[PDB]
């Protein structure tokens, strides 16, 4: 995904 990856 082009979005910012959130918390793992």
């Amino acid at each position, epitope marked *: 995904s082009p979005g910012t*990856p959130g918390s793992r």
Partner: antibody
Amino acid sequence: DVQLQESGPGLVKPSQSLSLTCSVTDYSITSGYYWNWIRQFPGNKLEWMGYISYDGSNNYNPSLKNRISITRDPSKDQFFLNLNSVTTEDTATYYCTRGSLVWGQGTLVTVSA
Amino acid sequence: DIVMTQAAPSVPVTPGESVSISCRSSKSLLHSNGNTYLYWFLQRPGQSPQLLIHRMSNLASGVPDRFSGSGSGTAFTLRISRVEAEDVGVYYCMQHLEYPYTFGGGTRLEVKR
């Protein structure tokens, strides 16, 4: 709450290196997100410089890739901007961010002899 | 690089009324996952930019719901309903589809009195 703060010198001489620190409070930089440097020139134009990811992987704006370095110290929840061989064109307000949502207050850096 | 264009340098608006701010991209920001990767920011005078809208139409956390986003492909609109004094500043769009992330030149909102 998660907060970011830029620190570093306000005046750097041309040909030398600009070194800024983003200190992150109340969040572990290994936990997720991209951690960006974004600068705003006099006249207000914004430029995305690059990021370091939660795993330490970098991604740089191609226009800066030869001069820029973004690193981190996970143990201190700090990440760093190093911009080599600065010119007057690098005069800007520098922001660190967590993704697009959380912004530091910005720090002005003037490049001049 | 994707070129982002905001045609209007500024827009005047009577308090309590609504206003639309336009943005355009040189390439479609639509992704196969269904999202369109266009973000909106407000920078109030003396302040850091703040996220208003992510992925074209999604309201960001902690943002008043008078801000909304719409668009299609290469054309985008930020709508601000019931404009208030705190809404003065410069509104920037930013594409988030491809690296490097790129910003429009900004549209200043002026309160008409």
